[PDB]
Amino acid sequence: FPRVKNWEVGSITYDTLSAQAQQDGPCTPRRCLGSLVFPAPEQLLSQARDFINQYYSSIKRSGSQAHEQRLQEVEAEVAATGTYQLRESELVFGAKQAWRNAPRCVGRIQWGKLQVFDARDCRSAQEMFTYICNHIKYATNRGNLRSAITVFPQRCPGRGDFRIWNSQLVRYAGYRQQDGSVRGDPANVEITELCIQHGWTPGNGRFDVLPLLLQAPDEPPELFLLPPELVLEVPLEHPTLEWFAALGLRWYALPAVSNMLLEIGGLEFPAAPFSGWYMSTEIGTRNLCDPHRYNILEDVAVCMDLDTRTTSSLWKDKAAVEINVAVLHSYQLAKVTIVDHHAATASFMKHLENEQKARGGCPADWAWIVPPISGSLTPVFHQEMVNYFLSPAFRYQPDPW
Amino acid sequence: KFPRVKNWEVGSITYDTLSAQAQQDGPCTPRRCLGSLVFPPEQLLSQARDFINQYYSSIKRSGSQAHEQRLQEVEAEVAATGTYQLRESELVFGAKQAWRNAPRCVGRIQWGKLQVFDARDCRSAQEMFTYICNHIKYATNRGNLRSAITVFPQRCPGRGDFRIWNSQLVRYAGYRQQDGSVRGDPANVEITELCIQHGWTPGNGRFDVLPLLLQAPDEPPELFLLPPELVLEVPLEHPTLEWFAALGLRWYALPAVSNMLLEIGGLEFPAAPFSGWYMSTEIGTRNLCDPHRYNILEDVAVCMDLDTRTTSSLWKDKAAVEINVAVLHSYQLAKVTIVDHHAATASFMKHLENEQKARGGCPADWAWIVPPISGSLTPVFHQEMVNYFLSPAFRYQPDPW
Numbered sequence: 001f002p003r004v005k006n007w008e009v010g011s012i013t014y015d016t017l018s019a020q021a022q023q024d025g026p027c028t029p030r031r032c033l034g035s036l037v038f039p040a041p042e043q044l045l046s047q048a049r050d051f052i053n054q055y056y057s058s059i060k061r062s063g064s065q066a067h068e069q070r071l072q073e074v075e076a077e078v079a080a081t082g083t084y085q086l087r088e089s090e091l092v093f094g095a096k097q098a099w100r101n102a103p104r105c106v107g108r109i110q111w112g113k114l115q116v117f118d119a120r121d122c123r124s125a126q127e128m129f130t131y132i133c134n135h136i137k138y139a140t141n142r143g144n145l146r147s148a149i150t151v152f153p154q155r156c157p158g159r160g161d162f163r164i165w166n167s168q169l170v171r172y173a174g175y176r177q178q179d180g181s182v183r184g185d186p187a188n189v190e191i192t193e194l195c196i197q198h199g200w201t202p203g204n205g206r207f208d209v210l211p212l213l214l215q216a217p218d219e220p221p222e223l224f225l226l227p228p229e230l231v232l233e234v235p236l237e238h239p240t241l242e243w244f245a246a247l248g249l250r251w252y253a254l255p256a257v258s259n260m261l262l263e264i265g266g267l268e269f270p271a272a273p274f275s276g277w278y279m280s281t282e283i284g285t286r287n288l289c290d291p292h293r294y295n296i297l298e299d300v301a302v303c304m305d306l307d308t309r310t311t312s313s314l315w316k317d318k319a320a321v322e323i324n325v326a327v328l329h330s331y332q333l334a335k336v337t338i339v340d341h342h343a344a345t346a347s348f349m350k351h352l353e354n355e356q357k358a359r360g361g362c363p364a365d366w367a368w369i370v371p372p373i374s375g376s377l378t379p380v381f382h383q384e385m386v387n388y389f390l391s392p393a394f395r396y397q398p399d400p401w
Numbered sequence: 402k403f404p405r406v407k408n409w410e411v412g413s414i415t416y417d418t419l420s421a422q423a424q425q426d427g428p429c430t431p432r433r434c435l436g437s438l439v440f441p442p443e444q445l446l447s448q449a450r451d452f453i454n455q456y457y458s459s460i461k462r463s464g465s466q467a468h469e470q471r472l473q474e475v476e477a478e479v480a481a482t483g484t485y486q487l488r489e490s491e492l493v494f495g496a497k498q499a500w501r502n503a504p505r506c507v508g509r510i511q512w513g514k515l516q517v518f519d520a521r522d523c524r525s526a527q528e529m530f531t532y533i534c535n536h537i538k539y540a541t542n543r544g545n546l547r548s549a550i551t552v553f554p555q556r557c558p559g560r561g562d563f564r565i566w567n568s569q570l571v572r573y574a575g576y577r578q579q580d581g582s583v584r585g586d587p588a589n590v591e592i593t594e595l596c597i598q599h600g601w602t603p604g605n606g607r608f609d610v611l612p613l614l615l616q617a618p619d620e621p622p623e624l625f626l627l628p629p630e631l632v633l634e635v636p637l638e639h640p641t642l643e644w645f646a647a648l649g650l651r652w653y654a655l656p657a658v659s660n661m662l663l664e665i666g667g668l669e670f671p672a673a674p675f676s677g678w679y680m681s682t683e684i685g686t687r688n689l690c691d692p693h694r695y696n697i698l699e700d701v702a703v704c705m706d707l708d709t710r711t712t713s714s715l716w717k718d719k720a721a722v723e724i725n726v727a728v729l730h731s732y733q734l735a736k737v738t739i740v741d742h743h744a745a746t747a748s749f750m751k752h753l754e755n756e757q758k759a760r761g762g763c764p765a766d767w768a769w770i771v772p773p774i775s776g777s778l779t780p781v782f783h784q785e786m787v788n789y790f791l792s793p794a795f796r797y798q799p800d801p802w
């Protein structure tokens with residue numbers, strides 16, 4: 001039962017919830033591997049059993065009549081068909097828990113406010129595209145972003161998987177150039193090659209929005225173009241540095257992760273895209289300044305006429321801070337929801353206290369909760385954390401190709 | 402079973418085969434990761450044997466004459482007395498290897514340049530004090546800082562204990578009020594409470610260099626007044642915000658860690674203060690800007706006429722970069738050795754590649770190697786790392802009371 005200290009205030013709690021940790025992680029007492037980014041009918045039953053207990057515990061009918069039937073229904077249905085179907089209420093309850101259990105998510109103060117779309121009756125890549133366009137449309141909401149998840153038909157024996165090949169619903173093309181370089185986003189060179197190979201006529205800008213590659217079961221992926229007027233984008237400008245808009249930088253409003261597997265009570269939904277709103281550092285710091293991403297840091301500092309020959313001038317840090325300022329200003333100007341890493345960490349601390357009262361702890365991967373700049377300026381820096389895996393959960397899964 | 406370790410800036414891959422040697426066990430289990438937590442008889446022969454076998458390999462004397470010979474003397478030394486004394490070169494070799502194995506030290510590229518003063522024949526606090534004072538004056542070197550460590554007599558059973566009560570050789574006072582809140586450094590409130598109890602006259606400053614509380618075996622502590630000309634300090638000023646000097650800020654030159662316990666070949670030296678030189682973020686970001694330390698961030702932001710009303714202004718981030726610029730600037734002006742976090746982390750990557758070729762890996766705790774500001778702007782953010790306990794080593798130790 002770990003003792004967890006917060007160093008800002010001095011408080012101490014004990015994460016009793018870590019004992020309920022089911023699936024095991026990559027660390028042992030010999031060696032910690034926390035900083036690594038990427039770490040049968042009877043067991044389907046005990047996961048299903050556990051989830052149904054969870055569900056009924058949340059509705060205050062733990063141990064009741066209905067409880068007994070469900071357990072009995074799920075067993076007899078596994079025995080009969082090898083699997084079982086979630087009810088709608090149980091599905092909504094499991095999308096929410098999966099978010100509440102994501103240790104690398106800082107936005108989890110919002111976990112109970114989640115719009116779940118049941119698309120488990122989906123039938124084709126063409127229906128799949130329609131459900132997605134409506135997800136984007138509802139989540140985006142003209143800049144007043146809302147959290148949503150669309151759940152496509154679960155993995156099941158006999159049929160292939162529904163898969164979204166794109167890591168996110170909105171990605172920018174990454175074209176490998178002549179001289180080995182990359183135009184656009186380098187994290188998406190591969191999805192870009194696949195889209196071309198499947199008949200997408202490429203562009204050559206730095207911010208070409210990628211088509212969707214949508215895989216129906218036992219089917220090749222099919223190419224679908226997003227309507228331009230569905231993808232709300234924000235041009236990036238600086239409140240005081242007016243040469244900044246001459247960079248032509250843009251980002252998109254809607255962060256919608258689309259390649260993660262959703263796990264509920266032993267069942268697996270390999271296509272369940274979810275979306276919220278951005279924190280300024282993900283765009284400002286990571287997407288635009290990462291040396292393997294758009295890598296603008298140098299060009300900004302040169303424009304700012306900072307001294308880039310030496311590092312002790314902290315030109316990197318000065319340029320980066322104004323790149324974030326610009327992201328926050330641009331998004332509020334465009335009236336698109338956005339949260340800065342101070343407010344986001346502040347309110348994640350409020351999540352951490354709400355969680356301690358409710359379950360006795362909270363899965364949190366420190367290295368992902370602390371923002372990529374100004375770490376120790378936020379309060380999550382000084383909070384010790386305990387990293388474990390609870391189910392329901394979003395897990396990574398391999399690329400379908 | 403050789404952990405795959407990736408660098409995400411470049412995409413390179415290495416395997417840490419050194420992690421297999423981890424004798425002492427850390428705090429993580431497959432159930433939960435505790436990496437972000439700060440803290441948690443003739444077996445002595447096995448520790449002494451393996452340490453000796455390191456030594457002779459490091460001098461290409463694996464399996465020859467003196468190798469077996471020295472092995473015999475340990476066997477016999479312990480057989481007679483129940484403990485043993487280190488050949489002075491082994492003391493030097495283990496002092497350097499403990500530094501080389503410190504997972505949380507980002508300055509380990511300097512590990513081979515360590516001055517080891519041998520204080521093993523010490524008896525009395527007045528004796529320590531001079532061993533300490535020679536260390537301080539050697540390492541400071543009029544501001545040309547030099548890594549040094551002084552090794553006071555190892556612990557043996559039935560004996561007392563050499564302990565330096567201060568967490569560091571140079572610590573600022575912290576004074577409580579008719580309203581509680583601290584003037585000076587709140588991290589040192591306690592040792593200031595002790596220093597006064599043992600008769601020290603309290604000052605009224607926010608940068609009052611504490612006395613020392615040195616303690617010899619089986620004896621109470623003795624206060625020691627450090628000579629002011631030995632405590633080299635740097636007044637803080639900012640190159641272009643001329644009011645910064647007016648704030649009255651200072652920090653000292655010598656980062657000197659007393660209260661940690663050297664552990665070599667099964668011997669335990671509870672008094673073994675080491676020293677090197679500062680990285681600017683330790684001073685500007687941690688010591689001056691932590692909410693539980695001096696916490697000057699809002700004060701500097703007022704003076705910059707920043708909009709502290711909203712957090713999306715990134716006033717915290719802006720003021721912090723300037724506080725760091727002033728620390729770098731001030732140390733460079735005083736001709737005192739200092740290193741910024743971009744220079745430091747880039748030198749630590751040159752360390753990891755060095756260590757790959759040499760020992761097949763390196764133990765590194767990611768959360769302390771990444772700087773407390775601008776983390777993703779430094780290359781070590783993008784480097785996966787593995788944390789484990791090699792020996793020799795510096796360990797945390799309980800307070801001597």
Ligand code: HEM
Nearest residue numbers: 099102104105106107110147149274275276277278279394
């Ligand atoms: C609405 C505001 C939200 C904010 C501010 C937010 C913030 C973040 C951030 C900064 C990360 C780390 C990103 C990275 O890997 O660099 C993250 C990860 C994650 N988020 Fe959230 N998120 C939000 C909503 C959601 C929603 C609605 C879901 C699911 C329904 C979700 C699920 C996850 C998961 C599973 C991860 C871990 C995967 C990973 O980071 O690699 N988040 N979130």
Ligand code: HEM
Nearest residue numbers: 500503505506507508511548675676677678679680769795
């Ligand atoms: C020469 C320049 C050096 C630099 C720039 C440097 C820098 C750092 C920094 C920034 C930390 C962060 C840990 C924290 O903030 O708590 C650290 C930890 C540590 N360093 Fe170094 N260091 C240097 C030399 C040394 C030497 C000479 C030794 C011992 C021989 C040493 C041993 C350690 C240990 C044991 C820790 C972890 C203990 C702890 O942080 O509680 N370092 N160092």
Ligand SMILES: Cc1cc(N)nc(COc2cc(CCN3CCC3)cc(F)c2F)c1
Nearest residue numbers: 255256257260274275276277278279286287
């Ligand atoms: C719903 C939601 C809201 C929000 N605000 N942010 C996210 C980001 O989620 C993710 C981002 C990535 C890419 C991470 N790379 C490091 C920098 C880019 C991978 C994932 F698996 C995520 F889950 C998701």
Ligand SMILES: Cc1cc(N)nc(COc2cc(CCN3CCC3)cc(F)c2F)c1
Nearest residue numbers: 656657658661675676677678679680683687
């Ligand atoms: C030799 C050396 C060189 C260098 N440059 N820095 C150091 C600091 O090491 C340490 C710092 C602290 C204080 C921690 N404070 C809370 C946040 C800061 C405690 C330790 F136990 C250390 F070991 C040591």
Ligand SMILES: C[C@H](O)[C@H](O)[C@H]1CNc2nc(N)[nH]c(=O)c2N1
Nearest residue numbers: 035036367368369782783784785
């Ligand atoms: C290798 C390193 O652990 C990796 O870059 C991690 C560190 N922390 C992170 N934290 C967040 N929020 N997002 C990330 O992508 C990462 N990357």
Ligand SMILES: C[C@H](O)[C@H](O)[C@H]1CNc2nc(N)[nH]c(=O)c2N1
Nearest residue numbers: 007381382383384437438768769
């Ligand atoms: C909770 C967290 O692990 C803890 O505050 C650590 C994080 N990283 C740190 N890094 C350094 N250099 N110094 C520290 O005190 C800490 N504190």
Ligand SMILES: [Cl-]
Nearest residue numbers: 255282283287
């Ligand atoms: Cl993103």
Ligand SMILES: [Cl-]
Nearest residue numbers: 656683684688
């Ligand atoms: Cl310090």
Ligand SMILES: [Gd]
Nearest residue numbers: 239240241242
């Ligand atoms: Gd301007």
Ligand SMILES: [Gd]
Nearest residue numbers: 703704705706
């Ligand atoms: Gd003024």
Ligand SMILES: [Zn+2]
Nearest residue numbers: 027032429434
């Ligand atoms: Zn761990």
